[PDB]
């Protein structure tokens, strides 16, 4: 490494950026912001080629004249993503004259996504393949740039891969392109001749098959990278020795520091206590969970908000899950705030579009409720479009001391699961629950419609299921069958069927239009006026309209009225 180790920094004046001159690694984050007076003649002759590694994230915002990062960051190779910026490890925002990215040497980002948006000159964007840089591409958001109503042509200087079946050349700048290394080394890094360096290395390296000649690696001790640091050196966020952790602890005594599991971490984990003799943390018989919240409030809108509660066990305040965007954040949410058994306050879920379940509270025992929402709610829900399941009630025990539940608009959440809460939580009755907005588009009809007869032909199938009748048989408007040529057991075709006439005239339908010797997946579900039943999906191989509801209700009303009048008791 041609330089020392730097902390993160935020750079008005461009001359502030000179501190990067003697730098190799920034273990924090690099933010360059709000130079409103610079112009490209201040960026022609400023280069920092000895920057090796960025740990957390790189953000550039409102910089005038930075048309390319080739000079600034020609050797920045890995942005790992220990600490993110709203689920993102690379954010470039509202750059005015940036047209070409330029950091061709960047290889991997271990954890995170990329946000490049509202950049009015950047165009070298469709030619960078992020599958070779990130593990996921469905989370990135590049939305508004120069190439939303225009194309610069993307003049390549190089490997090509498919977008949607068509191969396109992948390039970085006018003179460089992406290094799509072969799968022989998945991440170790192929060189010019195709040889790959040692497994404990990421991206780029000098001499193949050597732990020492690498520049970026998946720990690192001294001029070489290893899978685990040697016994004399404890792990870091680096492989540091006894000097580093004690030096930081004495400098603070601002974060304290503790040696634990051969890893120098800031604060002792749950149930572990510190003795002043040595920085090793020992188990403590006295219970001691960790999280003080200023103003007693914390809105979990991203990974960064969730990450401040990592290893947390007791929340000394309230949580407001407010995830937006539709991105699957379940795994990260569990990994961050899944250890919080106790929460001293109220829990709220507003406008969580992506949330399909709250199981990521894998250990959640006691919601206390000392402080409550307006209207005195200790569990709340509104506009959770894709929420269909709370904690798995078969094996999860939850306790709520005070407050009442609330459920306004959860279109895919069944009322049965909602009602199952009151039995287990302990709040038998305290209510708030809108019956026509929970599960309104859900197919969670609890009753079972068992199949009875199956007869398959070369182009047709014959189905017959056990009769179903609600307590008032006039409520059964009819039936609805669905089939679809499913490729494996792991949209449907909706049809309408009239109800059978009682007497049993075993109800069923005669399948038609099926192709020979192919499998089909099917189920039939009732429609009723307000119950409801569905047939469990079986597999077999081929060996403005709401006025009709009003008409049926009217038909019941007059027949009901006639009986009430013409039949009189003695």
């Amino acid at each position: 490494y041609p330089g020392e180790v730097c902390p993160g920094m935020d750079i008005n004046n461009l001359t502030r950026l000179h501190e990067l001159e003697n730098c190799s690694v920034i273990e924090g984050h690099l933010q360059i912001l709000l130079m409103f007076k610079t112009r490209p003649e201040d960026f022609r002759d400023l280069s920092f080629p000895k920057l090796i590694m960025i740990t957390d994230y790189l953000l550039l915002f409102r910089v005038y004249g930075l048309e390319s990062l080739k000079d600034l960051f020609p050797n920045l190779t890995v942005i790992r993503g220990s600490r993110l910026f709203f689920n993102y490890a690379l954010v470039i925002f509202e750059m005015v004259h940036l047209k070409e990215l330029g950091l061709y040497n960047l290889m991997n980002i271990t954890r995170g996504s990329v946000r490049i948006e509202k950049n009015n000159e950047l165009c070298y964007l469709a030619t960078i393949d992020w599958s070779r840089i990130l593990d996921s591409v469905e989370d990135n958001y590049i939305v508004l740039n120069k190439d939303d109503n225009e194309e610069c042509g993307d003049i390549c200087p190089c490997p090509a891969t498919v977008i949607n079946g068509q191969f396109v050349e992948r390039c970085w700048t006018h003179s460089h392109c992406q290094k799509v290394c072969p799968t022989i080394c998945k991440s170790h890094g192929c060189t010019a001749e195709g040889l790959c360096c040692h497994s404990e290395c990421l991206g780029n390296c000098s001499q193949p098959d050597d732990p020492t000649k690498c520049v970026a690696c998946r720990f690192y001790l001294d001029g070489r990278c290893v899978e685990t640091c040697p016994p004399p050196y404890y792990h870091f966020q680096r492989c540091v020795n006894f000097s580093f952790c004690q030096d930081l602890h004495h400098k603070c005594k601002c974060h304290q520091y503790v040696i634990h599991n051969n890893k120098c971490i800031p604060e002792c984990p749950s149930g572990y206590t510190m003795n002043s003799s040595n920085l090793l943390c020992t188990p403590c018989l006295g219970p001691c969970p960790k999280c003080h919240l200023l103003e007693g409030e914390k809105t979990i809108d991203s990974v960064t908000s969730a990450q401040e509660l990592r290893g947390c066990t007791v929340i000394n305040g309230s949580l407001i899950i407010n995830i937006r965007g539709g991105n699957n954040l379940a795994a990260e949410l569990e990994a961050n705030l899944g250890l919080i058994e106790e929460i001293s306050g109220y829990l709220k879920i507003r406008r969580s579009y992506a949330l399909v379940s709250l199981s990521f509270f894998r250990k959640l025992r006691l919601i206390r409720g000392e402080t409550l929402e307006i209207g005195n709610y200790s569990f709340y829900a509104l506009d959770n479009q894709n929420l269909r399941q709370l904690w798995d009630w078969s094996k999860h025990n939850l306790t709520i001391t005070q407050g009442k539940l609330f459920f306004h608009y959860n279109p895919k959440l069944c009322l049965s699961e909602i009602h199952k809460m009151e039995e287990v939580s302990g709040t038998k009755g305290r209510q708030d629950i809108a019956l026509k907005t929970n599960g309104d588009q859900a197919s969670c009809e609890n009753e079972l419609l068992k199949f009875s007869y199956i007869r398959t032909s070369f182009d047709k199938i014959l189905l017959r299921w056990e009769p179903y009748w609600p307590p008032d048989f006039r409520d059964l408007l009819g039936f609805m069958l669905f089939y679809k040529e499913a490729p494996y057991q792991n949209s449907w075709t909706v049809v309408d069927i009239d109800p059978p006439l009682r007497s049993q005239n075993h109800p069923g339908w005669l399948m038609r239009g099926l192709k020979p010797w192919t499998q089909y997946a099917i189920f039939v579900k009732t429609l009723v006026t307000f119950y409801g039943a569905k047939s469990d999906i079986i597999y077999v191989q081929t060996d403005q309209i709401l006025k009709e509801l009003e008409e049926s209700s009217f038909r019941k009303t007059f027949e009901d009225y006639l009986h009430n009048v013409v039949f009189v008791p003695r």
């Binding site: 307590p471 008032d472 048989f473 006039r474 009901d560 009986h563 009430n564 009048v565 013409v566 039949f567 009189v568 008791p569 003695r570």
Partner: protein
């Protein structure tokens, strides 16, 4: 639960005895459950 079915039940009970003439018979039999004890009373004396 007798909810046309009520007509057949009342005819099977009263038969040729006939019906009587001067909430009702729906909410008492269509909604709830009814027996021969509260349905024969609609037959004429």
């Amino acid at each position: 639960t007798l909810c046309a079915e009520l007509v057949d039940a009342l005819q099977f009970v009263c038969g040729d005895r006939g019906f009587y003439f001067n909430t009702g018979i729906v909410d008492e039999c269509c909604f709830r459950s009814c027996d021969l004890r509260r349905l024969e009373m609609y037959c004429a004396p």
